[PDB]
Design a protein around this ligand. Structure first.
Ligand code: NA
Ligand code: NA
Length: 57
């Protein structure tokens, strides 16, 4: 399942990942809590994204 960003998000540090609304992600870890480790299908960048900012495609 891919996930798609509902809103733009600007990351605070190198650990979280900035993204634009409509960006799609493949999710690598969702089991660690509510920030999921994800790779952007736009750029390939990988980092934590807030799981409440994305929805399944
Ligand atoms: Na970042
Ligand atoms: Na969500």
């Amino acid at each position: 399942t891919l996930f798609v960003a509902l809103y733009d998000y600007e990351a605070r540090t190198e650990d979280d990942l900035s993204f634009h609304k409509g960006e799609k992600f493949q999710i690598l870890n969702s089991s660690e809590g509510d920030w999921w480790e994800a790779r952007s299908l736009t750029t390939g960048e990988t980092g934590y994204i807030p799981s409440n900012y994305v929805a399944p495609v």
